[PDB]
Subunit: 62 residues, 10 copies
């Protein structure tokens, strides 16, 4: 048996938090993958207080 409980309220409760994000020409070319890929939290841009949870049992056959 699996399981992943998460506890109570989070979040900013204090001072100052500033985030600037100015990339110029980011490129990400991907091709020809084969298998599965799990991930809890993927942040390719700008994130703050992002919680993610993933569960997977995939069966892939060729």
């Amino acid at each position: 048996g699996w399981g992943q409980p998460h506890g109570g309220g989070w979040g900013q409760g204090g001072g100052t938090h500033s985030q600037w994000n100015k990339p110029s020409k980011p490129k990400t070319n991907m091709k020809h993958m084969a298998g599965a890929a799990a991930a809890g939290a993927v942040v390719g841009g700008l994130g703050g207080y992002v919680l993610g949870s993933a569960m997977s049992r995939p069966i892939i056959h060729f």
Copy 2:
């Protein structure tokens, strides 16, 4: 048996939070994928207090 309980209220309860996000020419070209891909939270733009959770058991056959 699976399961992922999440607890009570999150969210800002404090000071200041500012987010600027100005990319110029981000490019992301992907092609020729094969298998499954789970994810809890995908944030490609701008996010704040983002909660995500995924559960999946896929079967893919060719």
Copy 3:
């Protein structure tokens, strides 16, 4: 047996939260995918206090 309960009210109850989001020419061209793809919360634009949860058991055959 699966399950993913979520608890009570979240949301801003504090100070100041500002989000600017000005991409110039973001391009995302994807082609030739094959398999399933789960996701809890996908945010490609601007989000705040976004909760999402997905559940899937798909069977794909070729």
Copy 4:
């Protein structure tokens, strides 16, 4: 057995929350997909206090 109960009232009850979202020429063209894709919350524009939940058990055959 499945099930994803959500609890009571959420929402802003505090200070200030401002969101500007001005992309210039975003392009997202996709083609040649094959299989299923679930998602709890998809926000491609501007969102705030968005709750989504999806359950799917599709069978796709070719």
Copy 5:
């Protein structure tokens, strides 16, 4: 049996936190992958208070 419970409230409750992120022309070309790849939290852009957790048992056959 697996399992990964998490702690209670987290988040800024103190002083000042500033993050600038201005890459010039980051490129990431990946191709011809073979197998599974799990990850807890992938941050390719800008992140702050990002919590991720993934559990996966995939079976891939050729």
Copy 6:
């Protein structure tokens, strides 16, 4: 017995609050007075978020 248990946090919780005060030539005079005098909060200038409490049982014998 007695007691005035003030409680709770208070203060500005968002919004705009402007206070102006330009009296020309205010005056006040009290020549002969005698006896007790107790006040909770007395404001002669601007004020603002002001809390005050007083508790007095004097004995005066002429």
Copy 7:
């Protein structure tokens, strides 16, 4: 017994608060007074977030 148990953390919690004060020639005269006088919080200037308390049992026997 007696007692005024103030409590809680207070103060500005976000927003704008502007206070202006330009009295020209304010005056205040008191010539002959006699007896007790108790006050909780007295402000003749700006003030702002002000808290004050007082407890007094004088005995005077002119």
Copy 8:
């Protein structure tokens, strides 16, 4: 017994707070006074986040 247990941490928690004070020729006079006088917090200037407490049982015998 007596006692005024002030408690809690207080102060500015984000936002803007501007205080101005430009009186030209304020005046004040008190010629003949006699008796007790107790105050919690007296502000003749700007003030700001000010806390004060006073406890007094004088016995005056003319």
Copy 9:
């Protein structure tokens, strides 16, 4: 017994706080006074985060 148990750590916790004070010719005269006088916190200048307390039981026998 007596006692005023102040507690907690306090002070500025983020934000902007500007205080200005330009009185031109303030004055204050007191000629003849007699008797006790107790104060918690007296501010004749700027002030700022100011805390004060006072306990007194004088016995005066003109």
Copy 10:
């Protein structure tokens, strides 16, 4: 018994705090006084983070 147990570490915890003071010709006079006088914190200058306490039981026999 007595006792005023101040506690906790305090001070500026992030943010901006500017204090200005340019009074032109302030004045103050006291000619004839007699009796007790107790104060917690008295400021005539800028002040700032100031804490003060006082305890006094004088006996004056004219």
